[PDB]
Amino acid sequence: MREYDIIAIGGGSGGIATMNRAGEHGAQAAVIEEKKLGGTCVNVGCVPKKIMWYGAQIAETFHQFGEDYGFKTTDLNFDFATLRRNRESYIDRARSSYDGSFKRNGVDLIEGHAEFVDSHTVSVNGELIRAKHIVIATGAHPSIPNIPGAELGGSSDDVFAWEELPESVAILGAGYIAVELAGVLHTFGVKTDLFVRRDRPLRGFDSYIVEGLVKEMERTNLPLHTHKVPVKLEKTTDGITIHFEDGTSHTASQVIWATGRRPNVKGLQLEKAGVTLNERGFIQVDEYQNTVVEGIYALGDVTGEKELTPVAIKAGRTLSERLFNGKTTAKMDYSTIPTVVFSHPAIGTVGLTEEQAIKEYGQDQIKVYKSSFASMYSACTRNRQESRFKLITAGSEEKVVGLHGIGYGVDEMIQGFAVAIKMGATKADFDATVAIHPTSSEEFVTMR
Amino acid sequence: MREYDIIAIGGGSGGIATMNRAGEHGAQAAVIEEKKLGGTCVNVGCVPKKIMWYGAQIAETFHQFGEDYGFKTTDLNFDFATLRRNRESYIDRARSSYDGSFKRNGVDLIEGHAEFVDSHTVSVNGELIRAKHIVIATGAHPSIPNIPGAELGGSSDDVFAWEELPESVAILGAGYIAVELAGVLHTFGVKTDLFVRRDRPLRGFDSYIVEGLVKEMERTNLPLHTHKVPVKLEKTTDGITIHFEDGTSHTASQVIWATGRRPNVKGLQLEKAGVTLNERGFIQVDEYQNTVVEGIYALGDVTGEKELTPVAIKAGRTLSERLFNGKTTAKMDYSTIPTVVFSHPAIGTVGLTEEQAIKEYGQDQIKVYKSSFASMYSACTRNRQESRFKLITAGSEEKVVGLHGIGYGVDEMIQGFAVAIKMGATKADFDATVAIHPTSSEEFVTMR
Numbered sequence: 001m002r003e004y005d006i007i008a009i010g011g012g013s014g015g016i017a018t019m020n021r022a023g024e025h026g027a028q029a030a031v032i033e034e035k036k037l038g039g040t041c042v043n044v045g046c047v048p049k050k051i052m053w054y055g056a057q058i059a060e061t062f063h064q065f066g067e068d069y070g071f072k073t074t075d076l077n078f079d080f081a082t083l084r085r086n087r088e089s090y091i092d093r094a095r096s097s098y099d100g101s102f103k104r105n106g107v108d109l110i111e112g113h114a115e116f117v118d119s120h121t122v123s124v125n126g127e128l129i130r131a132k133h134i135v136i137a138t139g140a141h142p143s144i145p146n147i148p149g150a151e152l153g154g155s156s157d158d159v160f161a162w163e164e165l166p167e168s169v170a171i172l173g174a175g176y177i178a179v180e181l182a183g184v185l186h187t188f189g190v191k192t193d194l195f196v197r198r199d200r201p202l203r204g205f206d207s208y209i210v211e212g213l214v215k216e217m218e219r220t221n222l223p224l225h226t227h228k229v230p231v232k233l234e235k236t237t238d239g240i241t242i243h244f245e246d247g248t249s250h251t252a253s254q255v256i257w258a259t260g261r262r263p264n265v266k267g268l269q270l271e272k273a274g275v276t277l278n279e280r281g282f283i284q285v286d287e288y289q290n291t292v293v294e295g296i297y298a299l300g301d302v303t304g305e306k307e308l309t310p311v312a313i314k315a316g317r318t319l320s321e322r323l324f325n326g327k328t329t330a331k332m333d334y335s336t337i338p339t340v341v342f343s344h345p346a347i348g349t350v351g352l353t354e355e356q357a358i359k360e361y362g363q364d365q366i367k368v369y370k371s372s373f374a375s376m377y378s379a380c381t382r383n384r385q386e387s388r389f390k391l392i393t394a395g396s397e398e399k400v401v402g403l404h405g406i407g408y409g410v411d412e413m414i415q416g417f418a419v420a421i422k423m424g425a426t427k428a429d430f431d432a433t434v435a436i437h438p439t440s441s442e443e444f445v446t447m448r
Numbered sequence: 449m450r451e452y453d454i455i456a457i458g459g460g461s462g463g464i465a466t467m468n469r470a471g472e473h474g475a476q477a478a479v480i481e482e483k484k485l486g487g488t489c490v491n492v493g494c495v496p497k498k499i500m501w502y503g504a505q506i507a508e509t510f511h512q513f514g515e516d517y518g519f520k521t522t523d524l525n526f527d528f529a530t531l532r533r534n535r536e537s538y539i540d541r542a543r544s545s546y547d548g549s550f551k552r553n554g555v556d557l558i559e560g561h562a563e564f565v566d567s568h569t570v571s572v573n574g575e576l577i578r579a580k581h582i583v584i585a586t587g588a589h590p591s592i593p594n595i596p597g598a599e600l601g602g603s604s605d606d607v608f609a610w611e612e613l614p615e616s617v618a619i620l621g622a623g624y625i626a627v628e629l630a631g632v633l634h635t636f637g638v639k640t641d642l643f644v645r646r647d648r649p650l651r652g653f654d655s656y657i658v659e660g661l662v663k664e665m666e667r668t669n670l671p672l673h674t675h676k677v678p679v680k681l682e683k684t685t686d687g688i689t690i691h692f693e694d695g696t697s698h699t700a701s702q703v704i705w706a707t708g709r710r711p712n713v714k715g716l717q718l719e720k721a722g723v724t725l726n727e728r729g730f731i732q733v734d735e736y737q738n739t740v741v742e743g744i745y746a747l748g749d750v751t752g753e754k755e756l757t758p759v760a761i762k763a764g765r766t767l768s769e770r771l772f773n774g775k776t777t778a779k780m781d782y783s784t785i786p787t788v789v790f791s792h793p794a795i796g797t798v799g800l801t802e803e804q805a806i807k808e809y810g811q812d813q814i815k816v817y818k819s820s821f822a823s824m825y826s827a828c829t830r831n832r833q834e835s836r837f838k839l840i841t842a843g844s845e846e847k848v849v850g851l852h853g854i855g856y857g858v859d860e861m862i863q864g865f866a867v868a869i870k871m872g873a874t875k876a877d878f879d880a881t882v883a884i885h886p887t888s889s890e891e892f893v894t895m896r
C-alpha cells in the first residue's frame with residue numbers, strides 16, 4: 001500500500017524542490033522518477049547548455065579577439081569529446097548531490113513510471129502508493145509539428161546525445177532554445193542554418209534587442225532565413241532535405257525541431273484521479289497550485305505559468321511552506337520574472353516589452369530610453385560587437401516597468417535590476433545610483 | 449581679455465562633464481587642460497587598465513580552463529606590443545570623441561597650465577581668461593613616500609608608459625591599484641611580488657572577500673608579502689633592491705609605488721583666489737561643491753569625497769544643473785556608492801562591511817549571510833576557482849546595508865543591486881525576486 005504524507009510525480013526541478021522542503025518540515029516525502037534524477041535542467045537543459053555555451057565563448061575569444069590582444073596560436077585544435085566528457089562529469093556530480101539531499105531530509109526515491117489509480121493513490125511497477133497530498137510535476141517535452149517526415153528531424157534531446165558534432169545542421173524554430181543552439185554550434189564550426197517561421201526570431205522579446213541579435217548573426221555569417229514554414233522533410237544521400245511553403249528547399253546532416261515545448265499530461269490517467277486540463281492543454285490549477293480535485297496539486301512546466309527552473313523551484317518550495325509550515329495564504333508571484341537567453345551575445349530581460357506596456361498603461365503613458373554602444377572588450381579589436389540596452393518607464397513618476405539588454409556581460413547583470421524593478425523602482429531611483437566604471441552595466445543608470 | 453560664463457581648470461572626468469552640461473543649457477563654457485584630454489581615467493587609469501585586465505582574462509582562460517573545454521595548442525604566443533598598440537588606439541578614439549561633444553555644446557578647448565590671478569581670473573600662457581564661475585577639477589597624482597631612494601621606484605603612470613613588460617616587478621602597496629596591477633602583470637608572466645605594510649591588502653573591504661583574494665593569490669603562486677615596511681630603495685647590478693624594516697630585502701627590474709593618490713593643489717596659486725584647504729589637504733568645499741570664495745567651485749579627486757570617475761562626472765553634472773538650470777538645492781549624494789576592483793578574480797561591493805555594520809547598528813542587530821562556491825565555468829576544469837558572496841542585514845526588517853562579492857562575473861552584477869540597496873531593499877525583497885538560472889548572480893537571491 002505504501003504510506004507517505006506527500007508524493008511528487010516527477011523528480012525534476014519542481015518535484016525535488018517541493019519534496020525536499022516538505023521533508024524539511026517533518027513530512028514523510030517521496031519522489032517518483034522515470035528517467036535520470038534532476039529532470040530536464042540537470043540532464044538535458046540548463047546545465048549542459050551553459051557548459052557548452054562557456055566552451056563556445058572560449059572558441060569565440062580564440063578566433064575573434066585573441067589576435068588584437070596579442071595572442072596567436074599554432075595548432076588550435078578543438079576536441080568535442082573532451083568537452084562532452086567533462087560536461088557529463090559535472091552533471092554526474094550535480095545529480096549525486098540531489099540524492100544526498102533526499103536521504104538527509106527523509107525523502108524516498110522511487111524509480112518508475114507513476115500512474116493515477118484513484119484521487120489519493122498511484123501505481124508504480126504494479127505496487128500502489130498512497131498519500132494525502134500528490135504533486136504533479138511531470139514537466140514538458142519537445143514539440144514536433146504534425147507534418148509528413150517530421151520524425152526524421154531530431155530535438156534538443158538529440159543535440160546533447162551527440163558524441164561528435166555533425167558536418168551540418170538545420171535548426172527549425174524561433175524561440176530561446178533555437179537561438180541558443182544556433183549560436184553554440186555555429187561558433188564550434190558546424191555548418192549551422194537557422195530557419196524561423198515568420199518575420200524574426202524571438203517574437204515575444206523586444207524588437208530593438210532582437211534586431212541587435214540579427215545584426216550579430218549577419219556579422220558572423222550565421223545564416224538566418226525569415227518566412228520559412230516547413231511543409232515536408234525527406235531523406236537524401238547528403239542527409240535530410242527540408243521543403244518550405246514559399247518554394248525553396250535546404251539540405252543538411254541533422255535537422256533539429258526547436259519550435260516549442262508541450263506539457264507531459266497524457267500517460268498519467270488523470271481522469272481516474274479527476275484532474276482536468278485547461279483550454280491550452282496544461283493542467284488546470286488556481287493561484288495556490290491546487291487542481292480541481294482537493295489533495296492534488298500541480299506546478300512547474302506542466303502548469304505552464306512560466307517554463308523556467310527557478311519558477312518551478314520557488315513554486316514548489318512555496319507550496320510546501322503552505323502545506324507543512326502553516327503559511328495558509330502563501331503563493332507564487334508570477335509577475336516580473338527575469339530571464340536570460342545564452343545566445344551570442346547573451347540577451348537579458350525583465351518586466352514588460354514596449355508593446356506589453358502600451359496595452360497595460362496606455363500609449364500616451366509610456367516613455368522609452370535606448371542606448372547603442374560597443375563594449376570595450378570587443379571595440380579595441382577588429383570585431384566590434386554591438387550592445388543594445390532598453391528601459392521602459394510608465395506614468396508621471398516614470399516607474400521602470402521593463403528592462404531589456406543584449407551584449408557581453410548581460411547574463412550576470414539582470415538579477416540585481418530584477419530586485420529593484422520588483423520593488424517599484426522609478427527612473428529617478430536608477431539615476432540617483434552612481435555608475436560603476438568601466439562596465440557595460442553602468443549604461444542602465446546613465447540613460448537620457 | 450577673453451571672457452566666459454564658466455571655465456574648468458582640468459580637462460578630465462570632472463571638468464569635461466561639468467562644461468558639457470553647462471554648455472548644454474546655453475552657458476558659454478571652456479575646458480583648460482595641461483597634458484592629455486580625458487584626464488587620468490582615459491589616458492592612464494580606468495581605460496588602459498581594463499583593456500589590460502581583459503587581455504589578462506584571455507591569458508587566464510587559455511592556460512587554466514582551455515584544456516578541459518577541449519582546446520589545446522602546440523604553442524601559445526603572447527606579444528605585449530600588439531596589446532599596447534590597440535590599447536592606445538582605443539584611447540586615441542575616445543580622446544577624439546570629446547572634440548565632437550564640445551562642438552555640439554559650444555565648449556572651447558584651451559590648452560595650457562591654468563593659474564589663478566584673482567577670484568575671477570586665471571592665466572594660461574600669459575593670456576588672461578576671466579569668468580563668472582570657475583570650477584577647479586585638477587584631479588590627483590600618485591603618492592611617492594619620503595624614504596632614501598624613493599625616486600628609483602615608479603608609479604602606475606610608468607606601468608602604462610612601458611613599451612615592453614619587464615622580467616620582474618615589485619609592487620609596494622595595499623590599495624585597489626596595487627592589487628589590480630599585481631594580478632594583471634602576474635597573469636602576463638612577469639615575476640610579480642606584492643608587498644603590503646600590515647596584515648592584509650584592501651583595508652576597508654570586507655574580510656571574507658579579501659580572505660578569498662589572498663587564497664586565490666596563493667593558489668596561483670602570486671607571492672603576497674605581509675608586514676613589509678620599506679625603509680630604503682637602492683640601485684644595484686641585479687636590478688633595484690628594496691630594504692624592509694624587518695631586515696629582509698627583495699630585488700626586481702622595476703619597483704612600483706601604489707601607496708595612494710593625493711590631490712593636485714600646489715600649482716594653481718590658490719592663495720590668490722582665496723581658496724583654502726581642509727586639514728586632510730584637499731580643497732575645502734560644502735555639500736554643493738562651493739569653495740569659501742563666491743563663484744569658485746571644486747569637485748572630483750581634488751576635493752576627495754570618493755575618488756572615482758563617475759563621482760566626478762555626476763557631481764559636475766549636478767553642479768551645472770544648479771547654476772544653469774534653476775535647481776538651486778541640487779547636490780551630489782555621496783552615500784552608498786558601488787565599487788568594483790578588477791582583481792583576479794574581480795571584487796565587487798556596495799554599502800557597509802561587517803565591521804562597519806556592527807559599529808553602526810551593534811552586534812545583535814546584524815545578521816550575515818555567506819556563500820562559498822565554485823562557478824560552473826571553472827568547476828568543469830582542473831582549476832577550481834572559488835567565488836565568495838556576502839550579504840549583511842540590519843534590524844528586525846532585515847534592511848540590506850551591505851553586499852559584497854569576489855568571483856567570475858562579479859564586475860557586472862553589482863550595479864543592479866546598488867539601485868535596490870539605495871531604495872532600502874530588505875532580505876524579503878531579495879528572497880521575493882526569482883533567480884536567473886544558471887548564473888552566479890542568483891546566489892544573492894537564494895541565501896539562507
Ligand SMILES: Cc1cc2nc3c(=O)[nH]c(=O)nc-3n(C[C@H](O)[C@H](O)[C@H](O)COP(=O)(O)OP(=O)(O)OC[C@H]3O[C@@H](n4cnc5c(N)ncnc54)[C@H](O)[C@@H]3O)c2cc1C
Nearest residue numbers: 010012013014034039040045114138139300301307308309
Ligand atoms: C535545451 C533546454 C535548455 C533550457 N535552459 C534553461 C535555462 O537556461 N534556464 C531555465 O530557467 N530553464 C531552462 N530550461 C527549462 C527548464 O529545464 C524547465 O523549466 C524545468 O526543467 C522544469 O522543471 P519541472 O520539474 O517542471 O520538469 P522537469 O525538470 O522536466 O522534470 C520532469 C520529470 O518528471 C519525469 N516524469 C514525467 N512523467 C512521469 C511519470 N508519469 N512518472 C514518473 N516520472 C515522470 C520526467 O522523466 C522528468 O525527469 C531549458 C529547457 C531545455 C529543453
Ligand SMILES: Cc1cc2nc3c(=O)[nH]c(=O)nc-3n(C[C@H](O)[C@H](O)[C@H](O)COP(=O)(O)OP(=O)(O)OC[C@H]3O[C@@H](n4cnc5c(N)ncnc54)[C@H](O)[C@@H]3O)c2cc1C
Nearest residue numbers: 458460461462482487488489493562586587748749756757
Ligand atoms: C591606475 C588607475 C586606475 C583607476 N581605475 C579606476 C576605475 O576602474 N574606476 C574608477 O571609477 N576610477 C578609477 N580611477 C580613478 C579615476 O581615474 C579618477 O577618480 C578620475 O579620473 C578623477 O577625475 P578628475 O576630473 O577628478 O581628475 P582627472 O581625470 O585626473 O583630470 C584632472 C586633469 O586636470 C589637469 N590639470 C591639473 N592641473 C591643471 C592646471 N593647473 N591647468 C590645466 N589643467 C590641469 C590634468 O592634466 C588632468 O588631465 C583610477 C585611477 C588610476 C590612477
